[PDB]
């Protein structure tokens with residue numbers, strides 16, 4: 001229905017706003033663009049599904065997310081990839097893991113305060129019907 005298409009458009013507007021607020025935070029600059037395969041040739045041999053905030057914007061615009069649950073799977077993937085690729089005790093690895101956990105926690109906190117639970121339940125019921 002037109003009403004259902006209006007629901008998914010409101011979801012996309014919400015998701016672009018949350019993603020922009022993450023992408024402008026100085027702590028999360030390392031997560032804003034894909035890892036450059038020229039500068040880090042071993043990245044794609046270790047990390048099987050790369051993800052970053054510019055790719056998340058592209059996916060919103062391609063209508064890849066029909067629920068906030070869908071979207072948070074990709075935020076969780078940015079975080080898990082950082083913990084996997086950078087597991088050591090040295091300061092550079094510990095700084096990127098701290099920033100990855102902050103990105104995940106910040107996304108979940110914005111959604112807790114600003115996503116209506118009945119809006120999410122409506123998106124999940126339309127997705128299930130298709």
Ligand SMILES: COCC(=O)Nc1cccc(NC(C)=O)c1
Nearest residue numbers: 030031035036039040082085086
């Ligand atoms: C300056 O080197 C270019 C570069 O991007 N290196 C580099 C090294 C290790 C990790 C990461 N990024 C993530 C998201 O894990 C990036």
